[model samples]
Target chain A: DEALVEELANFRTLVYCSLCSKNWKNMAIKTCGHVFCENCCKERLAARMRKCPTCNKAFSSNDLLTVHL
Target chain B: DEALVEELANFRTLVYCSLCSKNWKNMAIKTCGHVFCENCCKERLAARMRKCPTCNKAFSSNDLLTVHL
Candidate 1:
């Protein structure tokens, strides 16, 4: 049980961006609800990629939202 | 450091729905990228009061998605 709790506690992957493996998640795409670090999402949007790395759903500047946690 | 680690381990609020305060988070609303339990989200949709509890963003069935995690 302690191992399970420890695993849950250390499951920090959800708190970080999968795209860059850096930066705490601070942004989410409204089109698909996929989250990423603000830097990664903005970089992709600025590069005209305009898609969610997790879901491949299209989005734009208006779909970007800053997440508080 | 152990105290900080313990705090992080105990920060499990994010894994539960803020609405019903039960159920593991398994759904997300695309309109604002807010996550809730599938039951709560679907109940809201079925009740025709479609919106995200976290952000008050409007959404519909089409905006709901199952989260793998």
Candidate 2:
């Protein structure tokens, strides 16, 4: 039970940034159901990387959304 | 704080079946990022419905997966 709680607390994969592996996930790519921190997504766009970090599915700036959960 | 806990317990949008709105989400459409209960998804397929109930995106049986979270 303690191990399960530890994993839930520190490695809540869905709530954490999948790319940077830090920060709460606050941005979602509508074209793909992948999420990351806003900063990571913006940096990807700035670097001309248009693919989702998790799925490699192509997305655009218009597909990005600021989400709370 | 009590109200917040109440909402989290009863209305966890991501964890609940978006279609039937009862069972925990256990099936996911890989083609789209939406999820539902296994029974709901299988029923839709059995009825020859090929679209995601939430986004209306088309999917095939191969695109469905049993997901835990």
Candidate 3:
């Protein structure tokens, strides 16, 4: 079996930057594997890049990529 | 001659995300056309995927991708 890539050691919490506010801050991931800080991800995507920074993966505003946090 | 690609209409400013911080931030480019914010892009490229988020382009930390980016 292929070995799974190891999760980042400091995966419990991570700092995030926002393309919209142009600032850095801490973010938490949801159980559903979505990470957002004060809806920053959504608001930013609404006005800027349509792709998720975590994955460089593209998705429509209504459909965003889910991460295991 | 082949037509040159047009720059984004709002060429003065654009927002981008980082694979590392998972936050949104405003970034500025230089005359050479490279953008960075407190080394976010460099840090992201090291901790996360080794690809360009904007163009999904690939390059070695010490090399370049002339055709893609």
Candidate 4:
């Protein structure tokens, strides 16, 4: 069919939080490999909520990392 | 502090499948915005293993998106 997010086909696919759809500043769920901004996913691990907010995957600090690019 | 993966500080932070540390030809988790190679995260959905491998978030085709960059 069409490429992923067809309407977004011509977009730059900016680094962003699909949860917040905010900015380039972000992090990754090393466990599930999902990404979101600090405001969105940081506390899940910090608060022992470990589950990723975006995908709700359980994890730990060992599973989270701030992003550079 | 050094930085995320301090030893990786000098590294280019290659666009990769941190899951496999493989290549940039990848896909993104639209629900969580997490990224991984199609080989790494695709079957997790298409194979009825819809849970993200990194975060383990359950998802559907609605939550998956092929990535460019």
Best by DockQ: 1
Error of 4 at A23 (Å): 8.2
DockQ of 1: 0.21
lDDT (10s digit) by residue, model 4, range B11-56:
3233556767656535766666566778877655566787767677
Docking class of 1: incorrect
Candidate number that wins on lDDT, 2 or 4: 2
What tens-digit string does per-residue lDDT give for candidate 3 at A1-69?
112112221221232333343332323222122334546766766688766555565555544322211
Instruction: Give model 4's docking category.
Output: incorrect
Minimum summed lDDT over a 10-residue window in model 4 chain A is located at: A4-13
Steric clash count of candidate 2: 0
Residue pairs in candidate 2 whose N, alpha carbon or C atoms collide under 3 angstroms: none
lDDT per residue for candidate 1 within A1-69, as digits (tens), equals 576556654555666677886676667676666777889988887798977787788899887776544
The candidate maximizing TM-score is 1
Q: TM-score of the candidate numbered 4? A: 0.40
- In the range A1-69, model 2's lDDT, one tens digit per residue, is 555455454435545686776776666676765667899999999999999766788999987766443
What TM-score would every model get versus the actual structure?
Answer: 0.60, 0.49, 0.24, 0.40
lDDT of 1 by residue, B1-69 (tens): 576556555445555677886676667666666777899987887888976676677889987766544
lDDT of each: 0.70, 0.70, 0.36, 0.58
Off-target runs (Cα >4 Å) in candidate 1 are A1-10, A20-22, A55-58, A67-69, B1-5, B8-10, B20-22, B29-33, B45-69
Ranking by lDDT: 1, 2, 4, 3
- For residue B9, what is the lDDT in candidate 4? 27
